[PDB]
Ligand binder design. Structure first.
Ligand SMILES: COc1cc(-c2cn(C)c(=O)c3cnccc23)c(OC)cc1CN(C)C
Ligand SMILES: [Cl-]
Ligand SMILES: [Cl-]
Ligand SMILES: [Cl-]
Ligand SMILES: [Mg+2]
Ligand SMILES: [Zn+2]
Ligand SMILES: [Zn+2]
Length: 108
């Protein structure tokens, strides 16, 4: 029995992962795939961690999920140089994901 907020966050997640066809952001980045990663990135984030937070009722709002999504993409721009495939992928995903997540206030 999931809450309406959990349901809403799951639906946003399905849309966001469709914008990552290479699966670069599905799971945590290890020091084996990315030498020295843990030496540089001190606040890691990825889509599997976000899904576990949803399941554990660790989100209070869509805002919180959007900020963790931003943190995941910004981390790739700190660790990887601008010329690399991972920096370019992060920029593309940040922009398409924010088109999904951003919206106008809704007033009564
Ligand atoms: C090339 O394959 C992968 C690359 C990355 C990867 C991601 N990001 C965000 C990086 O910053 C990054 C930086 N340097 C090296 C690698 C990566 C990955 O991370 C979980 C998983 C795979 C496995 N693949 C079958 C999907
Ligand atoms: Cl992987
Ligand atoms: Cl950007
Ligand atoms: Cl940009
Ligand atoms: Mg708020
Ligand atoms: Zn915020
Ligand atoms: Zn940008």
């Amino acid at each position: 029995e999931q809450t309406p907020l959990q349901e809403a966050l799951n639906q946003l997640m399905r849309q966001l992962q469709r914008k990552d066809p290479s699966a670069f952001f599905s799971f945590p980045v290890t020091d084996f795939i990315a030498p020295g990663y843990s030496m540089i990135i001190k606040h890691p984030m990825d889509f599997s961690t976000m899904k576990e937070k949803i399941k554990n009722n660790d989100y209070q709002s869509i805002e919180e999920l959007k900020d963790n999504f931003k943190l995941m993409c910004t981390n790739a721009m700190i660790y990887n140089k601008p010329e690399t495939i991972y920096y370019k992928a992060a920029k593309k995903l940040l922009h398409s994901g924010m088109k999904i997540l951003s919206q106008e206030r809704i007033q009564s």
